[PDB]
Each structure stands twice: as structure tokens, then as C-alpha cells.
């Protein structure tokens, strides 16, 4: 599509960080048994969607 040459390579992706992780915070609290995270282990959270499960 006039991009064939191979000089420029597009990567259109709405989920791309540019500014490093930055400003690490840690939230400590109790959870229920419905969750799927191993208790007593620090994990990373990326959005507010998967937090429920």
C-alpha cells in the first residue's frame, strides 16, 4: 500500500507506554476468595478491568 519499499515500518498500537514505569506505588489490603491472585505476593496492576477477577 505504497508502504512496500521497506523504509518505514508502522506499528499502529493504542497500548504503548513511552515514559517508563514511573512512580511505583503499593496498595496493601484484604481480598476475598473469589480472586485469582496468590495471597502474600506483590503483583503488578495495569488496569481497572481485571481487578475484579
Amino acid at each position: 500500500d505504497a508502504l512496500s519499499d521497506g523504509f518505514v515500518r508502522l506499528c499502529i498500537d493504542p497500548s504503548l507506554n513511552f515514559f517508563g514505569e514511573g512512580c511505583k506505588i503499593l496498595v496493601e489490603g484484604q481480598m476475598t476468595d473469589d480472586g485469582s491472585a496468590t495471597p502474600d505476593a506483590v503483583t503488578c496492576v495495569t488496569s481497572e478491568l481485571d481487578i475484579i477477577e
Binding site: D1, A2, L3, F7, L10, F18, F19
Partner: protein, 109 residues
Amino acid sequence: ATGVALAEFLQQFNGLAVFTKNTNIRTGIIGTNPRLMLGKIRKWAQDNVGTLFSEFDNINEDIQLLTDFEVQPKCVGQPGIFHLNMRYRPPVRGARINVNMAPALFDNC
């Protein structure tokens, strides 16, 4: 459309001489360096405001042009390769006015 437009704009750097690590293009060379390329790209971007992009939010940290020599680990980069990171927003439309209608029987000019 913005993907295709940026891809056609960036064709002017194909085969152009690039000067990294000295950024002092001598008198007569037809080269460039990452800062001048970043300026030109950022001007293209804020030139398409209204047709491809919204106004912006902070164009200083939205457009980044890094060289491959400073992205990959040491003694892994290749000469000529770049990395252009752009974060944009399509043109916004409409508003969300909040009317607060209220009469006033008294008068005090």
C-alpha cells in the same frame, strides 16, 4: 490515514546522510541530525492539527525521536535505524454544556 500520511512524509530521510555523535554537519554536507529531524517532524504534526490530529495535550513529551544506538543495549544498535514515538488524539467534536437556568424576579440594576 495518519499512518499513511506519516509514512509518506518520512520518505525524505531515506538515503539522507545522518550525523549522530557529532551533530555538527559540516559546511556543504546535505546531512541532518536527530534534533533537526525531530523539529521537522513535530512541525509536520502540529501542521496537520485540524485534519488528522486534535489540538494537542503537550507536544513536548508527545513526540519523541530516539536513535537505535540509545534504545538497544550497548554494542547492539545499528547505524541508520531510528525510533519515532508519537501519541495523538483525533479531532474532537461537540461539547458538554451544562445549562444552569434560573430566573430573577428582583431587580437591583
